[PDB]
Amino acid sequence: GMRQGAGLGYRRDLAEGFLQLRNNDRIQFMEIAPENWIKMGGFARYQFDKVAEKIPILIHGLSLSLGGQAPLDKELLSSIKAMIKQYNTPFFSDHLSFLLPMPFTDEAVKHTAARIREVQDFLEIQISVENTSYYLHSETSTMNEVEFLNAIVQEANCGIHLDVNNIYVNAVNHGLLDPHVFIDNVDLKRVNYIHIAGTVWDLLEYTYARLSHMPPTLLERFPPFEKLCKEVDIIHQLQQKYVKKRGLSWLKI
Ligand SMILES: C[As](C)(=O)[O-]
Ligand SMILES: [Fe+3]
Ligand SMILES: [Fe+3]
């Protein structure tokens, strides 16, 4: 325990800056993918484990493919459960995929929701689903992106890991959903984790003005460590502006 506030993602090449952090007052938590942890060497893992003595961890995975057709990877799920136990961190988020369009249909909602309920049963925790950029919008879609997300997470009864940039990117690429309409309609009571990497900064403020609580917010990004820490201080200063002005509580994971 315990994750709250503003954090930074772990990379083997930032290990020297992470290992010099004397506490988690500034970098309040870090993020790691299981796909990278699993394939760490002995010394890379040592450095990581040594940083995890001071800086708590959230697990955000790349490859579980929650809306995919291939059966769920039990070898991967087992490493996720092992990490949750090892680092004492009862959180997990991943993505829907990764050519073809991602159709926002009820058939895909029911399919994805059902797999998320299986992942939840195995891990014995509730997971969060991250909104991602998609390349091709399906002609067959019966709903828009925020409807789709909302529907999946309400039918799986899981959280939302909200990525601000991915909202902006789907608005730029497709022109289908105003990022302001997105945030106004997202099930914000379910957002327990946020990612941010100008107009996008303002979408963070727009979200912060509307959430029910203040979740952990990670700077997602190759610049030098202390620059990355100054960017994290700004996310945090922005969090405190909104916790103060709106009387919010900090969500602690
Ligand atoms: C780096 As992403 C598209 O999973 O927020
Ligand atoms: Fe992601
Ligand atoms: Fe992200």
- Ligand 2 geometric centre to CA of 162 (Å): 9
Q: Which domain holds residue 221?
A: 1-253
Can you tell me the distance from the alpha carbon of 186 to that of 206, in angstroms, rounded to the nearest whole number? 12
Cβ atoms < 10 Å from Cβ of 164:
25
- Resolution of this model in Å is 2.2
Can you tell me the distance from the alpha carbon of 33 to that of 57, in angstroms, rounded to the nearest whole number? 10
Can you tell me the distance from the alpha carbon of 2 to that of 58, in angstroms, rounded to the nearest whole number? 10
Q: 233: annotated binding-site residue?
A: no
Q: Which atom of ligand 1 is nearest to the CA of 195?
A: 5
Query: What is the domain count for the chain?
Result: 1
Identify which of 160, 37, 151, 141 has the alpha carbon closest to the alpha carbon of residue 95: 160
Identify which of 5, 127, 119, 16 has the alpha carbon closest to the alpha carbon of residue 56: 5
Q: 195: annotated binding-site residue?
A: yes
Q: Which atom of ligand 1 is nearest to the CA of 132?
A: 3
Q: Which atom of ligand 1 is nearest to the CA of 165?
A: 5
Ligand 1 binding pocket mutation candidate from 35, 94, 95 (most atoms within 8 A of CB): 95
Cβ neighbours for 229, distance < 8 A, ≥ 6 positions apart: 8, 17, 26, 27
Q: 107: annotated binding-site residue?
A: no
Answer whether 208's CB lies under 8 Å from 238's CB: yes
Considering every ligand atom shown, identify the ligand nearest to the alpha carbon of residue 195 and give its number. Answer: 3
- Ligand 1 geometric centre to CA of 221 (Å): 10
**Tokens standing for 78?**
């087992």
Task: Identify the CATH number of the domain in which residue 166 sits.
Answer: 3.20.20.150
